[PDB]
């Protein structure tokens, strides 16, 4: 219990697309973060962190849910 950083070290403002997303990850404020962070597995073969503060993020992410649900 000394110093803990949020899971999303940073976010990236580039408007991404749902075509590349296969796995979604959402972590609510934890003992390391006092807020909320959206995380996503990139098809490239790594992880990526989105900022719910951007409208395009709520969209590409919304489509993923509507796509994984309709599937």
């Amino acid at each position: 219990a000394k110093e803990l950083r949020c899971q999303c070290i940073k976010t990236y403002s580039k408007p991404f697309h749902p075509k590349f997303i296969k796995e979604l990850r959402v972590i609510e404020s934890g003992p390391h973060c006092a807020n909320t962070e959206i995380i996503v597995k990139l098809s490239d073969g790594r992880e990526l962190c989105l900022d719910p503060k951007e409208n395009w993020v709520q969209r590409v992410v919304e489509k993923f849910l509507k796509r994984a649900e309709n599937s």
Partner: peptide, 16 residues
């Protein structure tokens, strides 16, 4: 050869 009408990272310091 399907086109990717976009894009993904052009930097890398995002590994939770």
């Amino acid at each position: 050869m399907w086109d990717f009408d976009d894009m993904p990272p052009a930097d890398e310091d995002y590994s939770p």
